[PDB]
Amino acid sequence: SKLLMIGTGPVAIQLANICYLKSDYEIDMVGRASTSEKSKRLYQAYKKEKQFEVKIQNEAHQHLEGKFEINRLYKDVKNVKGEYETVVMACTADAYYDTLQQLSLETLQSVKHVILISPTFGSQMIVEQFMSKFSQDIEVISFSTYLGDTRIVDKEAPNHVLTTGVKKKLYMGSTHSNSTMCQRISALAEQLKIQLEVVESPLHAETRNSSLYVHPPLFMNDFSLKAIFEGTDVPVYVYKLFPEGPITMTLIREMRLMWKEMMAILQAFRVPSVNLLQFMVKENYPVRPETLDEGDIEHFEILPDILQEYLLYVRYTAILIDPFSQPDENGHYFDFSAVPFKQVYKNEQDVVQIPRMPSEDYYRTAMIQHIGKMLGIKTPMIDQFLTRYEASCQAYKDMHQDQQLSSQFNTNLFEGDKALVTKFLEIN
Amino acid sequence: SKLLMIGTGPVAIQLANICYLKSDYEIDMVGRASTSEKSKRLYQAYKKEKQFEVKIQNEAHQHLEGKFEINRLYKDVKNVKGEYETVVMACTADAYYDTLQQLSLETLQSVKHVILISPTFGSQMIVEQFMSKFSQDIEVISFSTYLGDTRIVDKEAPNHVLTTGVKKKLYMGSTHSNSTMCQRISALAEQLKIQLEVVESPLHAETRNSSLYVHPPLFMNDFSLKAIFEGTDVPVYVYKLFPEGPITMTLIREMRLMWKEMMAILQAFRVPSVNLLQFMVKENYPVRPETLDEGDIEHFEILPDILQEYLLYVRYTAILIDPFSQPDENGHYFDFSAVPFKQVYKNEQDVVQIPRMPSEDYYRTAMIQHIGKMLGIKTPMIDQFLTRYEASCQAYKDMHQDQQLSSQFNTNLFEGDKALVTKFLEIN
Numbered sequence A, B: 001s002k003l004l005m006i007g008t009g010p011v012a013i014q015l016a017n018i019c020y021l022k023s024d025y026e027i028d029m030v031g032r033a034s035t036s037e038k039s040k041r042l043y044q045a046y047k048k049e050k051q052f053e054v055k056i057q058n059e060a061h062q063h064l065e066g067k068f069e070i071n072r073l074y075k076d077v078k079n080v081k082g083e084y085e086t087v088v089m090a091c092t093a094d095a096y097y098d099t100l101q102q103l104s105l106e107t108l109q110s111v112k113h114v115i116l117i118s119p120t121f122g123s124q125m126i127v128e129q130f131m132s133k134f135s136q137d138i139e140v141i142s143f144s145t146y147l148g149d150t151r152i153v154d155k156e157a158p159n160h161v162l163t164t165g166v167k168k169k170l171y172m173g174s175t176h177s178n179s180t181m182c183q184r185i186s187a188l189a190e191q192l193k194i195q196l197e198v199v200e201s202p203l204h205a206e207t208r209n210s211s212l213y214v215h216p217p218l219f220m221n222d223f224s225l226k227a228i229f230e231g232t233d234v235p236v237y238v239y240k241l242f243p244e245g246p247i248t249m250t251l252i253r254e255m256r257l258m259w260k261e262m263m264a265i266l267q268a269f270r271v272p273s274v275n276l277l278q279f280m281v282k283e284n285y286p287v288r289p290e291t292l293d294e295g296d297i298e299h300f301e302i303l304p305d306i307l308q309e310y311l312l313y314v315r316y317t318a319i320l321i322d323p324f325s326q327p328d329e330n331g332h333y334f335d336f337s338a339v340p341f342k343q344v345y346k347n348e349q350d351v352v353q354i355p356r357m358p359s360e361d362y363y364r365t366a367m368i369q370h371i372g373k374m375l376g377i378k379t380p381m382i383d384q385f386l387t388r389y390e391a392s393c394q395a396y397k398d399m400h401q402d403q404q405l406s407s408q409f410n411t412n413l414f415e416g417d418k419a420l421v422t423k424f425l426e427i428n
């Protein structure tokens, strides 16, 4: 009956309101004031009001809203004490190891379920193999992604969050198929009117995230890396065609290549393949019927390479605008494409950070490359993504020796994570 | 030493200034007041000033500008009398037959050279076979297209015209290779600093026009035909992606198909094939080096079908903007794509006209289909273009029985033209 929610951002707050309203757990939340002025403001805001709040924008999302209190807000991970049956990881996947390893032995021994909200491919392996030293029968559950889009409207009230959208479909896998915990989650999803497909394993669920296949090619190319680390003369945009953004036949090829390296790896683990195009058009964002042939979408996996590339290119071109938005009087639709790149920035202690795009893709990609090695699968496209990213970080260090830089600029990170994946795969 | 310039629009006026300044010919120009309030205003404006004028916009085009008089402006074709060595056809190709056949026998017997400025594929055949009844050794010359872009800024002064652009490259073919007339034209081009490639025959030159291959698929599809004949709820645009315009994988396929039907026909006549992509990117409008692979461009003709289609699709997407224009401060480039469709319109006598796009493509396409039959080459894509266009004209007649309609709405036009092409091909 105790739950530990690791994270104090909007994801954590939204999940905590679901637990508060729909579970029997006492909820403790854990931030990190030590390492973060964002966590600190959140702690200060909660201390003052003694309430969090979730608002919604589309009334379709009733179930998710509410004001609530938790049992305890911990300032930092090291402060956690006692026993918790269930740990929810609502942080970034590149912190799961580093975070859990700050928990006490006593805490770590009490845990029966770890729930990964936004895992990468291999996260369940890391977390299972880590937590194995302390429980013998730890249940690990992975979602495909967080359930929607939540944010803070007002930075000075970060305990008030707004859920703007919910996903059409999530996937969930457990290390313990059809467990009590799976069934409760299923029953909860059905109340929140969120479609949830249960799959065979956590790894299966981790591969039904389109950002896996799409973000590395979009962000880890020289156009994007320049725009992130050096900037440009006029704004450029993530989803636009060259020269307005990175998209190009070269990029789409790299995406196909990466997707195929990935599909080799999944064949090794015996996980079904991902029809990328179908996934994008039937699950992410729709296009008009005239844009793509229903057969091409359905049979995408057996079509010739060049055709797969063409269809991917077309999908991206079809969403330069929102083709379902109301066009204005001159026939112009909403500019859906115009998402700027986040640049490296200085936090409030003058430390230079690399934004989540592409920091977290360096992580996802480094994990996939390390799993590729361990299985003897080749990964030459992944390799090149990593090399490019490492080259930009090295260029940044060389170019800005005055400046104080985060440890995201360092090599090589993730040794701990990689060692746990090595171990897990030796056993099986 | 007499030249007859058929046409009184901007093309005719620009060509006449070239003749006035750089030839020894006395120039007579022929309009058609009978059939046209545009011709009439032109005649009235010239009568009043007794000058035409060509201005230029880019000073790169010095050679072409000037004020001038001609020897005689004829109000109508039937009025022409006397002998002319050279006839320049500066009208639309769908009028060449109908126009020449209004000339007198005496006039028709004196003619040694006919020069086709904006011919379609087969125009030289029509004009050669027609004029054969009157001269035995008629020289016919075809250009690929008119030399640039000229227009009337001010409709009330249509004798004042502005040449805005000149083409990078023209092609010219003669029925009499390396004739005196070819060499004079070559020498004239070199003075106007216009690159002119002389080719083996007129038909060769008529096939180096990109509008041949591109306009029928762009305009003779159901999206475009609706927009032209019925209109739409918000403006749509010729060069935009669905739903903003017609461009789509379906369209590009039709373009490939048509281009291939055409390349079969040229193989019959032993004319070299047209590398469509190369032509578009090296001659029409450039793209950035990152957009297309130099090898794909060069080897376009031997690449697989799907790849040819992908590359065509990409070319069109790359020019949604002018990728060489100055982007503004938000990174937005000139909207090069936003060319509206011209709709059916009523002339000043309340007769409904079909605009040149697609009237003239119905002509070009009908000629190609008739040449296909005569050679036993199949043309199923062309056939469908014609069927669609005929269907829209029939729908318009059914839907607007109150309205007075032009003869562009009639079936079947061009019997005269087709009979001359039949004859020409029986002989060779």
Ligand SMILES: NC(=O)C1=CN([C@@H]2O[C@H](COP(=O)(O)OP(=O)(O)OC[C@H]3O[C@@H](n4cnc5c(N)ncnc54)[C@H](OP(=O)(O)O)[C@@H]3O)[C@@H](O)[C@H]2O)C=CC1
Pocket (backbone or CB within 6 Å): A006, A007, A008, A009, A010, A011, A012, A031, A032, A035, A036, A037, A038, A039, A077, A090, A091, A092, A093, A095, A098, A099, A118, A145, A146, A148, A149, A150, A151, A356
């Ligand atoms: N719409 C959304 O909100 C979506 C979010 N996601 C993903 O879900 C995850 C959670 O995102 P969200 O709540 O929105 O944003 P946050 O960045 O606020 O969430 C991540 C949480 O984990 C914390 N964290 C990071 N490193 C550590 C560490 N070493 N120890 C303890 N805690 C740590 C963060 O702290 P701090 O507050 O100090 O930054 C934060 O509280 C992210 O991976 C995000 O990208 C995915 C899709 C949509």
Ligand SMILES: NC(=O)C1=CN([C@@H]2O[C@H](COP(=O)(O)OP(=O)(O)OC[C@H]3O[C@@H](n4cnc5c(N)ncnc54)[C@H](OP(=O)(O)O)[C@@H]3O)[C@@H](O)[C@H]2O)C=CC1
Pocket (backbone or CB within 6 Å): B006, B007, B008, B009, B010, B011, B012, B031, B032, B035, B036, B037, B038, B039, B077, B090, B091, B092, B093, B095, B098, B099, B118, B145, B146, B148, B149, B150, B151, B356
């Ligand atoms: N930038 C440009 O100007 C370009 C033009 N072209 C093409 O070159 C050709 C000439 O165009 P342009 O001068 O610009 O425009 P116009 O429409 O003014 O030119 C066509 C000329 O031929 C005349 N004509 C049409 N039918 C007949 C007939 N039965 N008897 C006698 N004359 C006739 C027209 O008369 P009227 O004045 O009554 O309409 C006009 O004088 C067209 O095919 C055009 O599409 C091609 C590329 C670029």
Ligand SMILES: N[C@H](Cc1c[nH]c[nH+]1)C(=O)O
Pocket (backbone or CB within 6 Å): A239, A284, A285, A319, A336, A337, A339
């Ligand atoms: N909805 C994601 C991201 C996005 C594209 N354009 C704007 N945002 C997708 O590609 O389907």
Ligand SMILES: N[C@H](Cc1c[nH]c[nH+]1)C(=O)O
Pocket (backbone or CB within 6 Å): B239, B284, B285, B319, B336, B337, B339
């Ligand atoms: N310049 C022609 C026509 C054009 C395209 N976009 C605007 N105009 C071309 O396609 O190359």
